[PDB]
Amino acid sequence: MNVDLLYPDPVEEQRKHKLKRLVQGPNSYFLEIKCAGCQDIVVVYSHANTPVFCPGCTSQISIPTGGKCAFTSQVERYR
Amino acid sequence: MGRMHSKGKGISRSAIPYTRAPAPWNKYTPEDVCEQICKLAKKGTPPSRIGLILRDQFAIGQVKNVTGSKIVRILKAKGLAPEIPEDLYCMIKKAVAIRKHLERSRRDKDSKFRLILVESRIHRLARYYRQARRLPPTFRYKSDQAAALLAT
Amino acid sequence: MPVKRRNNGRSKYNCGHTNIVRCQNCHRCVPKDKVIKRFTIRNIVDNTIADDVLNACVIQGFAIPKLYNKVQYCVSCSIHNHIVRVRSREDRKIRTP
Amino acid sequence: MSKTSGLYTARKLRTVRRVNRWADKKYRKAHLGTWLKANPLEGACMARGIVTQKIGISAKQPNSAVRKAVRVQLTKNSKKITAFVPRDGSITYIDNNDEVLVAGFGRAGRAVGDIPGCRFKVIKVAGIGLLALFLRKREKRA
Amino acid sequence: MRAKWAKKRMRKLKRKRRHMKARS
Amino acid sequence: VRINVLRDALKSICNAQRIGKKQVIVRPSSKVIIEFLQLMQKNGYISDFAVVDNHRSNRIVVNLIGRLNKAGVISPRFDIPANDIEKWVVNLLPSRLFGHIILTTSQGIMDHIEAQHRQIGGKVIGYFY
RNA sequence: GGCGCUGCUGCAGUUGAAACGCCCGUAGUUGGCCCCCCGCCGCCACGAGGAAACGGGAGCGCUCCAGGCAGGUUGGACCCGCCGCGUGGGACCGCGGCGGGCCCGGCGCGCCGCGGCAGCCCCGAGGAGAGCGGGCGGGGGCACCGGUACCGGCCGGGGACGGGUGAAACAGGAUGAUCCCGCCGAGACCGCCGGCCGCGCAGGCGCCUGCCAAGACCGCCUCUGUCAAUCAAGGGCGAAGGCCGGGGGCUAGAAGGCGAUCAGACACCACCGUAUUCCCGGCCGUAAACGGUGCCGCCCCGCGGCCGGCGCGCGUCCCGCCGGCCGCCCAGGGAAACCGGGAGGCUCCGGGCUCUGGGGGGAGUAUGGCCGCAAGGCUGAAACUUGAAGGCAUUG
Numbered sequence A: 001m002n003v004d005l006l007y008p009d010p011v012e013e014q015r016k017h018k019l020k021r022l023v024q025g026p027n028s029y030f031l032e033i034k035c036a037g038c039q040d041i042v043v044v045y046s047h048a049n050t051p052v053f054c055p056g057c058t059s060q061i062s063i064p065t066g067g068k069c070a071f072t073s074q075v076e077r078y079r
Numbered sequence B: 001m002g003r004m005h006s007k008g009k010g011i012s013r014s015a016i017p018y019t020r021a022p023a024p025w026n027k028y029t030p031e032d033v034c035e036q037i038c039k040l041a042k043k044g045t046p047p048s049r050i051g052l053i054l055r056d057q058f059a060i061g062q063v064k065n066v067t068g069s070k071i072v073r074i075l076k077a078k079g080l081a082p083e084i085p086e087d088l089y090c091m092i093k094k095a096v097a098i099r100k101h102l103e104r105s106r107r108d109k110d111s112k113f114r115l116i117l118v119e120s121r122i123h124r125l126a127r128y129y130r131q132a133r134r135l136p137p138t139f140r141y142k143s144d145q146a147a148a149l150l151a152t
Numbered sequence C: 001m002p003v004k005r006r007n008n009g010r011s012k013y014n015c016g017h018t019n020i021v022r023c024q025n026c027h028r029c030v031p032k033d034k035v036i037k038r039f040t041i042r043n044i045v046d047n048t049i050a051d052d053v054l055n056a057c058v059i060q061g062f063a064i065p066k067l068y069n070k071v072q073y074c075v076s077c078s079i080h081n082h083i084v085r086v087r088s089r090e091d092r093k094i095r096t097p
Numbered sequence D: 001m002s003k004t005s006g007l008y009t010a011r012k013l014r015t016v017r018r019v020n021r022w023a024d025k026k027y028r029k030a031h032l033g034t035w036l037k038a039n040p041l042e043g044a045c046m047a048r049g050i051v052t053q054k055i056g057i058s059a060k061q062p063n064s065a066v067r068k069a070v071r072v073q074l075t076k077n078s079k080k081i082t083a084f085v086p087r088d089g090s091i092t093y094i095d096n097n098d099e100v101l102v103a104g105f106g107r108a109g110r111a112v113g114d115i116p117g118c119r120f121k122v123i124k125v126a127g128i129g130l131l132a133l134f135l136r137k138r139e140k141r142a
Numbered sequence E: 001m002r003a004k005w006a007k008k009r010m011r012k013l014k015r016k017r018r019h020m021k022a023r024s
Numbered sequence F: 001v002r003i004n005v006l007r008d009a010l011k012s013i014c015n016a017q018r019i020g021k022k023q024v025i026v027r028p029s030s031k032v033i034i035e036f037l038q039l040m041q042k043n044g045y046i047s048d049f050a051v052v053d054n055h056r057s058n059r060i061v062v063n064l065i066g067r068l069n070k071a072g073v074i075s076p077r078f079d080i081p082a083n084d085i086e087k088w089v090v091n092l093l094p095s096r097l098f099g100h101i102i103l104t105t106s107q108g109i110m111d112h113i114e115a116q117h118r119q120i121g122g123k124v125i126g127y128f129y
Numbered sequence G: 001g002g003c004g005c006u007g008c009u010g011c012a013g014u015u016g017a018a019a020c021g022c023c024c025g026u027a028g029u030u031g032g033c034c035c036c037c038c039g040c041c042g043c044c045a046c047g048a049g050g051a052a053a054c055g056g057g058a059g060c061g062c063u064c065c066a067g068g069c070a071g072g073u074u075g076g077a078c079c080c081g082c083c084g085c086g087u088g089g090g091a092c093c094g095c096g097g098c099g100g101g102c103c104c105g106g107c108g109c110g111c112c113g114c115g116g117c118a119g120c121c122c123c124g125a126g127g128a129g130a131g132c133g134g135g136c137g138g139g140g141g142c143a144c145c146g147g148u149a150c151c152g153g154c155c156g157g158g159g160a161c162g163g164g165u166g167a168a169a170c171a172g173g174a175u176g177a178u179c180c181c182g183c184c185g186a187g188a189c190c191g192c193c194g195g196c197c198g199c200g201c202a203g204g205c206g207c208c209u210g211c212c213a214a215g216a217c218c219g220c221c222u223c224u225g226u227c228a229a230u231c232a233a234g235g236g237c238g239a240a241g242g243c244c245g246g247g248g249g250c251u252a253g254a255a256g257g258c259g260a261u262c263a264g265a266c267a268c269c270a271c272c273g274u275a276u277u278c279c280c281g282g283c284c285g286u287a288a289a290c291g292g293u294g295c296c297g298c299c300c301c302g303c304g305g306c307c308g309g310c311g312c313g314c315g316u317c318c319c320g321c322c323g324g325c326c327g328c329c330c331a332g333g334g335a336a337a338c339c340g341g342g343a344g345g346c347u348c349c350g351g352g353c354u355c356u357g358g359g360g361g362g363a364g365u366a367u368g369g370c371c372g373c374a375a376g377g378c379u380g381a382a383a384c385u386u387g388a389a390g391g392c393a394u395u396g
């Protein structure tokens, strides 16, 4: 069926390599998480591999994993 | 990359956003991220790691979008840029490490091969920096003297 | 002498050199990925006496032990003793056992 | 591209051609200078000499014959050659001291046909053209 | 001849020539 | 490394049409490639194209209508006096009546007919027919 | 000239002759994209200036003609030297604090911050280098360490042959062998698992435990800003055999010895055995060092397998992406065999760089030079000879 290369479907464009898209763009994004014991909320990179702490805690709350990073006992969002 | 001194052919790299503007949640002004950059440089953090720390803790994707300059340029503006650029410094460090390993092991030919490759890369980059007026015209990499210049 | 096989007569993929084995018939040196290889499982006593050993056994519930042997021959010995045959040009492409 | 390109490579393109020109046997034979040295005629169309002997030469494998020839000493460089006498019955005009004008067989110094080691041929004997001697137009003294 | 043995023969010849030319 | 972006663009376009495709993407773009496609368009050999920006060397999307027998570049860009044009016409072109040799001159990029209409020379960059 | 068999236009290098064993690397050649409307090159056009004859070429009946410049107011017009000089263009190809007033015809030279200017950073390559995180692998070096087996020695047992071959003979045995079991010594080796597995620049890479430095890939909204490609000279590594000096010494085993066979057997087969095979420090620099296929970059119908990393989906799977190793194959290519991740996009011929070949012999020889302890290696002719040699494929 008739696809136009100048206006590709975004869904089948997201499954391609970030560089061979029509207009190259990042794959990562930021997101908000909530401390399990503090009311407040902090903004965290999705592919972090460096220490990330609480405003209060002295325990690091992120685990680097070679791709998207995981977190210890916290509950997240997307903004 | 991984292609000047091997048969690699890998393409792993980062691709930055098309739109060149602060973040929607960006509270920071240039004068207050320059503060964090300079505090991190005084502490001894190399310029490639400063960007990592600002990305991972302060939620800043690109420093250029929030200030208008680049990290090494801001360091240079506040007189806190290094004497030697970071990449040449790292290559000299690796050369010193391999030589110190070879002092105990004279039968390791693989390490001698890689030492040759590293030092060739060092000379080429030193020539680039020299003709660009980012280094004294008398700069020269010397294998014997390279261990004690790392302290300075 | 044009090229006869796409594998050049051996199974060597992405390496320079492989190990040496000795032919079990004539003892020549063959590279490991070229030698003809067969695995055999058989009974230590021939089947033609496999029930007379069994009936003359004192141990209740005995089971005849087996032998596990990997035979490896060179090209010449394999053709001579009929482990492999010379095949037609079309048939040479067949990998079925 | 298996050949160098580029707007500033004229020197290389000329050096390559100068070097590979010598790989051709024709060019090397005509330009080196060793064939001019070794040539019995010294790069000339013909040459005169005196007959030193009369000889018969076997033919090559599929043929069977006895070809007639003469050993000749060259006047101008004192070299030894052998020259063929064509045209039935012509070996009878060649005394053992007969100035002969001698030319080539063609093929510029290669043997022709079935005569082993023959590259020259007699065209004139003691002043008189051998072909006209065969065709019975002129005759020798006695 | 098999070319390997022709090469062997030629090497022996060249070594004989070197030895004979060594005298004088 | 990459040296002649126009050569790769023209090879890609010829491949895509030989398959029987409607569109083709060529990257990177450049001023010279846009001039070459503009001349090809004005002669009628291709349809619309579009240069898409990526704060880098851009892409181009080319629409194809099956009229291109062949297109190529001449490397290096030899210079041509006004009187040698025809000694090139009977070299690259299938006839003296259709086809185009593209020159760059101090009066812009143009085909050979206009180059002998203004009786000037220049440097050859490519051809299509 | 034929001859695209000298190839700039325009040859060939899997197998016909021909890709250096491999990596680094200077000279050289080549180098993505972007600002237009300045300067300096190149380049295109038009001029000026300098020789005619020759070569083109306007006009003319030496009766024609090769000619000549004639002729009946006439005529011998014009064009053709050049990397220099002048005028114009400016696509393509490179290379590159200002104003005002002191001050005054201009230019320099300094002098005042005088208040006039938006004062003085393209971008961030499906180029490259550097980084951080994550796994990955017979990649490398040093030390240590287990296992049976081959060989040798010792205790006990028992009592006639054992070994070896296609068949035998020489070796061994009543000084008790061969065979069975326990104990000891030494030096090699690393099985089955072990692969259309994996790693390394190639040569190559597999016992236990510890230490040491490295590497490609993937992931990334990390850093720099063209720092690149290929490479004479030059540097480094490089199977096995071989050499120099030390050590060690099980096995196998060039040389040598011996039993058969045979017309002969100085060989194939049997038996014994020196160098060698193993370690350390050097030398040598070659292999069918093979994918007989140089390196970097682009496009390219499809269907599968395996290896490493990552992401989405349901409830281990499943669908993708990048990188690697393989099989089949439409088109296209080709002398064909076949290739097809190229050997495709090529007589419709031009992306960049380096090397090699030009009928068969003579000959990789002679000679000279450099290197090597030597054995060699690298470089490398000519006289002369010859009508074919060779590739892939068909029938017998």
Ligand SMILES: [K+]
Residues within 6 Å of the ligand: A015, A016, A017, A020
């Ligand atoms: K993709």
Ligand SMILES: [K+]
Residues within 6 Å of the ligand: A016, A017, A018, A019, A027, G321
């Ligand atoms: K991606």
Ligand SMILES: [K+]
Residues within 6 Å of the ligand: A027, A028, G311
């Ligand atoms: K991702």
Ligand SMILES: [K+]
Residues within 6 Å of the ligand: B003, B004, B005, B006, B007
């Ligand atoms: K490389």
Ligand SMILES: [K+]
Residues within 6 Å of the ligand: B007, B008, B009, B010, G323
């Ligand atoms: K790779």
Ligand SMILES: [K+]
Residues within 6 Å of the ligand: B009, B010, B011
């Ligand atoms: K790649």
Ligand SMILES: [K+]
Residues within 6 Å of the ligand: B111, B112, B113, B115, B116
């Ligand atoms: K070294």
Ligand SMILES: [K+]
Residues within 6 Å of the ligand: B112, B115, B116, B119
């Ligand atoms: K070194």
Ligand SMILES: [K+]
Residues within 6 Å of the ligand: B119, B120, B121, B123, B124
């Ligand atoms: K270097």
Ligand SMILES: [K+]
Residues within 6 Å of the ligand: B115, B116, B117, B119, B120
């Ligand atoms: K080096």
Ligand SMILES: [K+]
Residues within 6 Å of the ligand: B123, B124, B125, B127, B128
């Ligand atoms: K350099």
Ligand SMILES: [K+]
Residues within 6 Å of the ligand: B123, B124
């Ligand atoms: K250098």
Ligand SMILES: [K+]
Residues within 6 Å of the ligand: B083, B084, B089, B149, B150, B151, B152
């Ligand atoms: K420093």
Ligand SMILES: [K+]
Residues within 6 Å of the ligand: C001, C002
């Ligand atoms: K053949």
Ligand SMILES: [K+]
Residues within 6 Å of the ligand: C008, C009, C010, C034
């Ligand atoms: K084979």
Ligand SMILES: [K+]
Residues within 6 Å of the ligand: C012, C013, C014, C015
């Ligand atoms: K393998």
